[model samples]
Target chain A: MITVATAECFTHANIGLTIHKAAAGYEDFEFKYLFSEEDLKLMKNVRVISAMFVPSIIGVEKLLDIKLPEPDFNYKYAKAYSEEKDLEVAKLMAEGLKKKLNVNISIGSTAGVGRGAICILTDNNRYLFTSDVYANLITFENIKERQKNGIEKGIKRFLEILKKEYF
Target chain B: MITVATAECFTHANIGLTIHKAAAGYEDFEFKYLFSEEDLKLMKNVRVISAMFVPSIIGVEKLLDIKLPEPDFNYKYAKAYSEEKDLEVAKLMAEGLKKKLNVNISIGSTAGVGRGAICILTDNNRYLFTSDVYANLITFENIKERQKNGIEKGIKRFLEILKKEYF
Candidate 1:
């Protein structure tokens, strides 16, 4: 089974990029960036492509000109962008969660309910881990409150599904 | 020679992870959380380890229990972390810059400047990049300020050192 690891609460400043199409003849364009050996090993059968944005890549002129509206703290636009680029990736991953465990898996951040980083485990032992970049910006007290809420309510929904399906 | 690319600013909500020696086998583990084939290509020379954290191996229990401290948005911490991870990447890229031209580089970041993404251009071709993640949490207006005052200033210093060494 495939799993996704991601942060519980992501800030507004993060940027993610997904390549939706190859322009038919330009598949090689994507490979020009970097081609490390480890990438080949992990991606032997994964047909889809998705990448999390590094902080360095966010504000570049080439990236910002993509014509998407600015993302808010809630990340509505960002999520839409992800879907637009590769709905299949999101769908397949979510399906992987459901098929292996018999529960629905929601991808994307839940507003005001989650905090810090989290990992999503799949049956195959691969996990997706995420952490909040904004946690450091808020007060320590507020961070704690958010973390508590995330653990109590937000995480419970995910946990209940996992336990019911997997274990 | 090496060249710096244009700067771009992003929202602060992006997710990130840094695995320390204890968790990453006593070696530093730094990577973008999102998984994509293109990024994997970049990981060829760079070490990419399989942990429970990769997207394929994620599970629900791992998601519920993941933890990350609220890092203080201190420049020192940022600098320390960058030095620990990307600094070597920068220096290696810098060698290519020096070979193409005649110059030296002193790498550093601006204090409290958030989200000022910079690309170190060497002789207008090769490049290395860095950005301020915490500073992106501030307003976009503040982002520009930090970029001008902090990142630009740092780059200027870099250029100045190059000029002094070459000219």
Candidate 2:
């Protein structure tokens, strides 16, 4: 069986939960939805994690032995001109999870507030994408929209990679 | 400062995260997002959690010491005839958290593929509501919509309750 794990932020567990539902019925595939590093330990032989705010990624960063510059918690926009920092961290997170979890595929996404970023890492290649929903609205509806678009885009891209590699 | 925590299901952590953002300026309030009973322990003083599928509520059931009939994991629809089970569990979850956490307010929400339910428990009052997105689409978009509407309704109601009680 191929075990896939997701580390998510901003979109909460939407990305992983979507993958789990979409990939159901494929007996050869397994999906693990993670909310924290502690979940990894609970799964025994299999491990995965999740992130909330950018700073919460610290736990996963420690788990993967990767470091990132602290993000401005007070930063209000989802994206400022571009999601460069988002793409960078997503890349690092995907790669780190691929190595740390020893899974066939690892996805790391942080698309919250103003800007969003996602990375899907496989044994042979890595894919990175960003969505610009940066805003200062800070309202619940606005945050949900940014996350909705990000999850849609990320899930579509993630499925494409999965199809090309394993399906 | 008043402490608030959310125990979430199909809405993932959207409810708590939204509350966190909306109440950002309220120095008198604190919010905690939970994914497991372990999170509660890790929180030292906190004690909150999250649920995914209907069955995943098991942990919270154990933690809250509430017994519930098992929900069918294979149930594909978001709702059947009504959200009776959802309301029952959400109410139980809310009351359980209010008692166990000893917090000023507690919220419990379980809205998944077919139906949705949310409950807010204050020191002296209890509010219960449900939304019928009743879906069988099973597509990622459909699930997102079900959850989106659920979160929107739940958050709106939650804010109304907060305004009435604390603001």
Candidate 3:
């Protein structure tokens, strides 16, 4: 079997690089850069099992998916839970692209201010879709190190899931 | 030989529960529940080593820590780039909560749309901060299915890192 993972980004170059690096070591694995809408075309030849966030705008539905919150909605968290639920729906549907016929996942994350996320989806039914809001507490210089934090931290675990389940 | 990880809300509840479930068989291993701020306070006697994103506000610094984006900031990516650095600092400092005082997180992650983060930070450094972004897509009744999605996918992998690094 062969496979790879990728995302498009300026800020998240490490995510792409790490995928490139990890997949390079495997003859059965080669990651493609789903960097643009054009690139999503490439996933066709592959078996398209994505644990990734997806091939579309992330967390965007929280903004775009809804005209407004539910009538019963209240501001419990910083943002509306009703809206977050809508975004969650948007997120899953985007991830559902694998179930869908097609979709680069046009890769430019909101990056730092948002959350760090990773995915593990196996048709055998094992799945992982996780996100964490990271700290906005310290000083920063280069964009890469912080971005690297998400990749290095998540990728190792990503690889572990792959190794155990598919490999 | 064992500790625990936790967070708030239905989505993250699976995180702590799964961590507890995973370690149950080990006679010498057990995990704890540092679930809330009070429980985090409940964690006062325990040594803390963190790599996982904080249990509290994900990143507040985009506001409190700095001025608005540079007045002349042009492209969105540049501001994106600048903001990424600051959050990077935040990520590190929070990560620092583990290394500086006792933080140098050993890491593990579940990749996906939901946020189920857990770090049982002993010196061994096992960590998990996973986000799936799937919540933005799916539609249904009980929201728990989406929340459980993160746990089902990541917890096995989460345990594996601990086994590899500390066990």
Q: Say which docking band candidate 3 falls in.
A: incorrect
Pick out the ten consecutive residues of candidate 2 chain B with the lowest summed lDDT.
Answer: B46-55
Q: TM-scores for all candidates?
A: 0.24, 0.49, 0.27
Docking class of 2: incorrect
Superposed model 2: Cα runs more than 4 Å off: A1-7, A10-69, A73-106, A111-116, A121-153, B1-7, B10-69, B76-106, B111-116, B121-127, B132-153
Question: Candidate 1: where are CA atoms >4 Å away?
Answer: A5-106, A110-141, A147-156, B1-167
Task: Report how far off residue A114 is in candidate 1 (Å).
Answer: 10
| lDDT tens readout by residue for model 1, B1-167 | 22221111121111112211111121222222222344333222121111011111112112212222222343211121222233333333234323322322212122223343333333434334445343332122354344344343433443443344433
DockQ of each candidate relative to the true complex? 0.03, 0.05, 0.02
Q: Rank the candidates by lDDT, best first.
A: 2, 3, 1
lDDT of 3 by residue, A1-167 (tens): 23332321212333433343333221222232222223233222222111222112221222123222231233111122222343343234334432331212211122322342344333444343333434221122333343445554445444555445544
At residue A165, give the lDDT of candidate 2: 77
Worst 10 residues of 1 chain A by lDDT: A15-24
**Cα DockQ of the candidate 1 complex:** 0.03
